[PDB]
Amino acid sequence: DGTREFLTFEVPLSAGLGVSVKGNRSKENHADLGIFVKSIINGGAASKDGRLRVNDQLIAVNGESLLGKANQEAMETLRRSMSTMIQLIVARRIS
């Protein structure tokens, strides 16, 4: 329900990001909310870089949007985009 702003940063490349991400859903409104950073694994690329933060919503990866789709598809798109430096676009609360 909170207000978020869009930020972008580059994270250099455990030749992965080193994060756990979780889908969020609204019970009452029967609606997927997006994919959100749950934890940032210490020693990981994300940890070293320092810019990604828990509860950031992942919006795009190297220009590949995660938005116009469901948590399942979005998660897939993300994994796919890592197999083939990551440019992240995140949405972070101002609330």
């Binding site: 990001l17 756990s20 998660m75």
Partner: peptide
């Protein structure tokens, strides 16, 4: 929903 660790 699911969570995926991306190592």
């Amino acid at each position: 929903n699911m969570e995926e660790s991306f190592v």
